[PDB]
Amino acid sequence: EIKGHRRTYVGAMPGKIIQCLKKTKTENPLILIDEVDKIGRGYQGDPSSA
Amino acid sequence: AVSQLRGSTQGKILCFYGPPGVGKTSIARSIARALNREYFRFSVGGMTDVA
Numbered sequence: 169e170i171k172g173h174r175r176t177y178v179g180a181m182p183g184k185i186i187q188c189l190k191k192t193k194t195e196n197p198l199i200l201i202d203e204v205d206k207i208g209r210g211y212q213g214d215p216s217s218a
Numbered sequence: 219a220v221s222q223l224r225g226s227t228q229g230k231i232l233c234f235y236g237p238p239g240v241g242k243t244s245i246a247r248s249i250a251r252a253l254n255r256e257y258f259r260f261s262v263g264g265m266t267d268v269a
């Protein structure tokens with residue numbers, strides 16, 4: 169979700185950030201990450217590394 | 219000094235250890251620009267996917 173998909177998978181779509189950059193159309197927006205405290209820290213690929 | 223003797227370049231491993239924030243990482247890059255080798259950081263803290 170933070171990095172999209174390979175684009176070789178069926179139905180892959182770019183990660184969320186590219187969408188925000190596409191939408192605000194500026195190179196330097198003010199992203200607001202939310203709820204860092206509760207990141208799902210699982211075996212399924214740790215976002216905290218991401 | 220040893221690389222200067224036995225001809226060609228050679229690799230070797232090393233380890234540093236000590237309290238955080240002593241500058242370990244800073245010296246890494248400084249050495250890389252000393253020998254003229256290229257630098258590349260690679261964290262592996264807490265990783266588990268060997269792939």
Ligand SMILES: Nc1ncnc2c1ncn2[C@@H]1O[C@H](COP(=O)(O)OP(=O)(O)O)[C@@H](O)[C@H]1O
Binds near residue numbers: 238239243244245
């Ligand atoms: N004795 C020192 N000589 C040069 N830089 C130092 C020294 N002590 C602290 N630093 C500074 O400490 C900072 C962090 O060092 P570094 O090893 O990159 O991160 P960390 O210390 O968290 O491992 C660097 O900006 C570095 O310049």
